[PDB]
Design a protein around this ligand. Structure first.
Ligand SMILES: [Zn+2]
Ligand SMILES: [Zn+2]
Ligand SMILES: [Zn+2]
Ligand SMILES: [Zn+2]
Lengths: 388, 388
């Protein structure tokens, strides 16, 4: 046909604006009256040359659709990954407690069996003692029935053996005892008692930790085992060869750098009366007397006179309510994910009690830092020990 | 039937050695100085013993067969009590096992939901993008095939192709990111789930209803016994029965608590003065009541809306460390078995906080006691509600 629907005249015109073929009348009185126009010939010539370029536009469009269908198929996997990571991480955290539970129940069930079997067999022993006795009394009744009708010489020797044997049985006979099994007492407090213990069980395994003697204040000696540090009363040859060496702080940091995750490590303080535990930022300065404040790179807990605890927070420290018994072991929890450094009185591993927690984004990495302090003319002689 | 050491007839019997001997043997030193008896008289004397001796034989034989019974019974009593233990741990430990299982299931169900929802979100936008691509590629095929065509059919194909591309370039957005809201699973998760577990340990909240017949005349109990307030109403001056409080504006519950474990929560809102706890049953309720355990009053009290006190045995009540958030619901744990009454800031059930706990043998029975305190001309008008 190649003609107009509305007018039936050859579509010899092309409208540059509406980009569609039109007929003569359409340009004259039609909706295409005032538009920018071209003859079909010049329009065919112009678009022959364009066609590689239009062909390229379509491919640019196809690329951009193919690019977007890529992003979605990647996302469609990231969903199953993120769900697995979540659904997996949950099971793992819960698994800590589930294990703790099964461990505790096993330990009790083993003490159940131990008392069961052990108290069990003492009875089966004394049971045999009574069956042999009854069986002996049974024969003695049988002899006594047959002896009533015996010759003089035979009756007499039987009755002596019988009455003299029954004599010995009566002194050898023990009175029965009542059943007394000592099983662990299971109270109303029980469900709480386990719950309290679960806290220690939530923590990650104690970080492998060893003092760095190459950071040690000269008066400080580190044990060969790498887990004991002491403040000696002897002359100290100072060494300013390394900026990591402590000169005025009387302290030492650990070998291990801490960069990500969650870590827990306990420190036995015993009856030491002045010390400070915590962590140091890596590039923080170690030379001179340092004010204990996080802005100086110091996340620090210190004890004075063995009775007053203080948290070296952002000049004056915060005096913590001293626990009812002086603590003999401190725990340090550290999580970069959550930006937290928690201190615990770990003297009783079954009942951990928090003392204080920093709650800020920490600059990673940090070094477990330990301030032994001066032996103070013989008084602060007690060592610092790493539980492990 | 004669003596071994020499052939002489045993017609002699020795009362001391209780053994037949021969004549020579009574003259021989082996049995010489002993008290002796003829064998005939000994046979006559022991014939009469035989009825009495037979009774002695069975007299002991009876008590031994009964004693093998008591011990044979103990062998099951041991296996039963051990089972009772092993069962008892299962239940208390299961109390956490169920909690943990359920929390996992709830999280597992929300994750699956978020998963499937994103599942169709992408597969939808995906399927649409492909259909665009399939038509977009189809258009390339038109553009190659038509390049050599006559003017009129070529041109209208170029219009039709470019006009479809017109619409497609409008309907589709840039790739855009993946948006999943999952609960954030941090290192802190195991800790929050642990705290939440605490409240789950407590027994089901006691059915408790205020007993209006104990009530101070100026307080009205409403809502099926679970609401009391002190209204500024016409108050009958007092009742006659000692069961009614006349001076303290207080009310006890109907229910008597005599044995076991009990947990009940009391919504206090921003009521600024109150006292919660328990009163011994026959302990006095008439007159000004001094708050001390020796008078049957175990009480945790709030004053000025900010200071909590523990009415322990002293002249002045004991000022508690008040938490940084005003408590809006108080919890009460009770065990006669362990002799404990525990107060908790139960404002947030996922994290109960201990407030104070008495640790003494409790007089049974006891009444949940509630001191509303005077309405103070409109200030302390707020009620006490029992959660359930
Ligand atoms: Zn036309
Ligand atoms: Zn037009
Ligand atoms: Zn003889
Ligand atoms: Zn004799």
């Amino acid at each position: 046909q190649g003609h107009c629907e509305e007018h039936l005249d050859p579509l010899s015109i092309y409208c540059e604006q509406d980009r569609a073929l039109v007929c003569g009348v359409c340009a004259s009185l039609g909706s295409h009256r005032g538009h920018r126009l071209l003859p079909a010939a010049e329009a065919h010539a112009r678009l022959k040359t364009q066609l590689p370029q239009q062909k390229l536009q379509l491919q640019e469009a196809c690329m951009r659709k193919e690019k977007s269908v890529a992003v979605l198929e990647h996302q469609l996997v990231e969903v199953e990954e993120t769900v697995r990571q979540f659904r997996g991480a949950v099971g793992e955290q819960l698994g800590k407690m589930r294990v703790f539970l099964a461990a505790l129940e096993g330990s009790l069930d083993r003490e159940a069996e131990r008392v069961r079997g052990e108290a069990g067999v003492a009875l089966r022993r004394e049971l045999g003692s009574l069956n042999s006795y009854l069986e002996q009394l049974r024969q003695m009744e049988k002899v006594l029935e047959e002896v009533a009708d015996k010759p003089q010489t035979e009756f007499l020797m039987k009755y002596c053996l019988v009455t003299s044997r029954l004599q010995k049985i009566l002194a050898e006979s023990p009175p029965p005892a009542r059943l007394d099994i000592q099983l662990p007492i299971i109270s109303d407090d029980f469900k709480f008692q386990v719950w309290r213990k679960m806290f220690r069980a939530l923590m990650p395994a104690l970080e492998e930790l060893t003092f760095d003697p190459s950071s040690a204040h000269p008066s400080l000696v580190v044990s060969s085992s790498g887990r004991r540090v002491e403040c000696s009363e002897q002359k100290a040859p100072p060494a300013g060869e390394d900026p990591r060496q402590f000169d005025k702080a009387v302290a030492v940091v650990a070998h291990q750098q801490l960069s990500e995750g969650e870590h827990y490590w306990e420190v036995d303080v015993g009856d030491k009366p002045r010390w400070a535990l915590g962590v140091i930022a890596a590039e923080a300065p170690r030379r001179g007397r340092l004010h204990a404040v996080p802005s100086q790179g110091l996340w620090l807990l210190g004890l004075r006179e063995g009775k007053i605890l203080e948290a070296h927070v952002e000049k004056e420290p915060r005096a913590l309510r001293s626990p009812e018994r002086r603590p003999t072991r401190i725990g340090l929890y550290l999580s970069f994910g959550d930006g937290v450094l928690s201190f615990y009185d770990a003297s009783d591993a079954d009942a951990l009690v928090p003392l204080f927690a920093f709650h800020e984004r920490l600059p990673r990495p940090v070094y477990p830092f330990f301030d032994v302090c001066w032996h103070d003319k013989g008084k602060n002689a007690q060592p610092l020990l790493l539980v492990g």
